[PDB]
Amino acid sequence: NKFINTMSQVPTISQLLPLPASDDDDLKHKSWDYLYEPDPKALLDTLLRRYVESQVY
Amino acid sequence: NLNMDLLYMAAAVMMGLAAIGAAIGIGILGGKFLEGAARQPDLIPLLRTQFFIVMGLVDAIPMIAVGLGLYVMFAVA
């Protein structure tokens, strides 16, 4: 359920996996790109796991 | 006589070695600047000025070699 406000609440269902978020675009990011340690992929896995955990919390 | 024949060879080998060393060193120095400018263009002039600073030291000995080869070829003959 979602806390719209004090007076009203709504039951809702929303997707977690796969990542439903709509795409976005930027220039500053990935141009002045992050240095990746150790490598960009493992960081992406941990990041996605932490993100879905935060969503459910 | 043999003197000039050997002196032209000496000048040729000295200037060739100097050119090889100077060209390879300047190419490496430039390549690192190119990667640093590719990473973040907001620091391009700063890296480009330090590039001039370092390149000034790079050509130190190669230009001594070039000058002495020129001397051998043009005044010693």
Side-chain angles (χ1 to χ4, degrees), chain A residues 30-33 35, chain B residues 38-42:
Chain A
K30 205 66 183 67
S31 55
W32 344 133
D33 189 10
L35 272 66
Chain B
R39 279 157 56 192
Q40 37 182 356
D42 287 340

Side-chain angles (χ1 to χ4, degrees), chain B residues 9-19 64-66 68-70 72:
Chain B
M9 175 78 251
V13 54
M14 171 157 54
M15 277 186 277
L17 287 177
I64 304 177
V66 168
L68 290 167
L70 285 175
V72 165

Side-chain angles (χ1 to χ4, degrees), chain A residues 1-2 5 20 22-24 27 29 37 43 48-49 53:
Chain A
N1 304 270
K2 305 311 293 305
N5 48 33
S22 302
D23 60 333
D24 42 76
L27 280 78
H29 275 246
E37 167 181 330
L43 267 53
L48 292 174
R49 288 165 31 96
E53 174 72 325

Side-chain angles (χ1 to χ4, degrees), chain B residues 4-34:
Chain B
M4 303 177 186
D5 308 323
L6 259 298
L7 289 167
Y8 277 100
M9 175 78 251
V13 54
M14 171 157 54
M15 277 186 277
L17 287 177
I20 290 185
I24 300 182
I26 292 183
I28 305 169
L29 185 66
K32 274 298 184 309
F33 162 73
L34 286 190

